[PDB]
Amino acid sequence: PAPALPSRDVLETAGELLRALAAPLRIAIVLQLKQSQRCVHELVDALDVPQPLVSQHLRILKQAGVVSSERAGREVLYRLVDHHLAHIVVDAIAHASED
Amino acid sequence: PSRDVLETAGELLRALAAPLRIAIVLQLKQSQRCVHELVDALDVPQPLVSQHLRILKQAGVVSSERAGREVLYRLVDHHLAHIVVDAIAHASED
């Protein structure tokens, strides 16, 4: 019949995850990172927003467990921790467009 | 996607972020429900539930419609349940 209720803990953590994804620029970063890992200057070029703003949204995504970074040669690359998180934003976009 | 579509998607995600809202969506994913069935399953005051539903409705996440004597709430589409279910899946790691 009627599920469940996860804890409390699971529901609050799910809540924070959604709030971390809920900004037009974070949505747009997650879309970039679904296609390719990127450094900051490339996100700056693709999104047309200055670096200090990009960096702050990346910090917000990293704190939330959505992205990580790692050295690759002479640059730092950001990547999505799990590509299923991109499905959240893709579905949000689908809903928004069917409306 | 346009600026407006990104903004609208972001407002959707903000509306779903409360923990009772996620709880409401997971109930509605299984079946349409009247307010009192949600009150039972969630274990929460009636007027509070109703407050979350009026907000979910304004946000375009739930709709309500008569079915005989009841007014039933449903999810507007399946995209919404997938969002909540994938968030729960992710938040279940730790």
Side-chain angles (χ1 to χ4, degrees), chain A residues 17-87:
Chain A
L17 177 66
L18 292 176
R19 175 79 190 201
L21 293 170
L25 259 159
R26 296 190 302 265
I27 284 161
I29 288 155
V30 170
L31 293 181
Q32 293 292 311
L33 296 178
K34 169 147 82 330
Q35 306 295 281
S36 172
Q37 300 191 75
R38 309 283 179 162
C39 54
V40 185
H41 52 81
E42 195 177 344
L43 290 171
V44 165
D45 294 338
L47 302 177
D48 302 302
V49 306
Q51 177 275 122
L53 258 70
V54 176
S55 291
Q56 171 158 290
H57 287 293
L58 286 169
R59 169 188 58 74
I60 295 158
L61 291 167
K62 196 179 293 183
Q63 286 173 5
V66 181
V67 307
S68 45
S69 59
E70 187 170 6
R71 197 203 146 196
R74 257 191 318 274
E75 299 290 317
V76 173
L77 297 182
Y78 290 84
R79 71 173 158 94
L80 286 176
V81 165
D82 161 43
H83 281 238
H84 290 289
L85 298 166
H87 298 150

Side-chain angles (χ1 to χ4, degrees), chain A residues 1-6 8-19 21-24 27-28 31 64-66 81-82 84-85 87-99, chain B residues 1 3-14 16-20 22-23 26-27 30-31 33 41-43 59-61 76-77 79-80 82-84 86-88 90-92 94:
Chain A
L5 276 196
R8 227 56 175 285
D9 227 299
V10 166
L11 283 180
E12 298 154 41
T13 295
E16 302 189 322
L17 177 66
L18 292 176
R19 175 79 190 201
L21 293 170
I27 284 161
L31 293 181
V66 181
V81 165
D82 161 43
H84 290 289
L85 298 166
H87 298 150
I88 294 167
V89 308
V90 175
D91 285 315
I93 295 300
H95 179 84
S97 306
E98 297 162 19
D99 167 35
Chain B
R3 169 193 174 183
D4 208 13
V5 173
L6 295 182
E7 279 168 40
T8 300
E11 296 164 28
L12 177 68
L13 297 173
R14 268 186 325 276
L16 293 166
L20 290 196
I22 288 158
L26 292 168
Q27 288 302 305
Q30 298 310 131
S31 154
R33 296 295 178 193
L42 298 200
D43 222 49
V61 174
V76 168
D77 60 41
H79 296 305
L80 302 159
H82 300 155
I83 286 164
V84 151
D86 300 356
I88 296 312
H90 182 97
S92 294
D94 44 35

Side-chain angles (χ1 to χ4, degrees), chain B:
Chain B
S2 65
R3 169 193 174 183
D4 208 13
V5 173
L6 295 182
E7 279 168 40
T8 300
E11 296 164 28
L12 177 68
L13 297 173
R14 268 186 325 276
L16 293 166
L20 290 196
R21 296 180 201 174
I22 288 158
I24 291 180
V25 168
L26 292 168
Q27 288 302 305
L28 299 180
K29 159 199 211 20
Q30 298 310 131
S31 154
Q32 297 189 54
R33 296 295 178 193
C34 72
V35 177
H36 300 89
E37 282 172 291
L38 295 168
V39 170
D40 285 27
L42 298 200
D43 222 49
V44 154
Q46 197 271 20
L48 186 56
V49 165
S50 286
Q51 124 84 349
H52 285 319
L53 293 169
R54 198 215 320 100
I55 297 170
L56 286 178
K57 193 186 304 217
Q58 288 171 15
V61 174
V62 305
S63 62
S64 76
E65 197 179 352
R66 179 158 299 279
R69 206 214 287 230
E70 312 305 322
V71 176
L72 301 186
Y73 287 86
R74 63 169 183 287
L75 290 184
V76 168
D77 60 41
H78 293 102
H79 296 305
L80 302 159
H82 300 155
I83 286 164
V84 151
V85 160
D86 300 356
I88 296 312
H90 182 97
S92 294
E93 274 67 312
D94 44 35

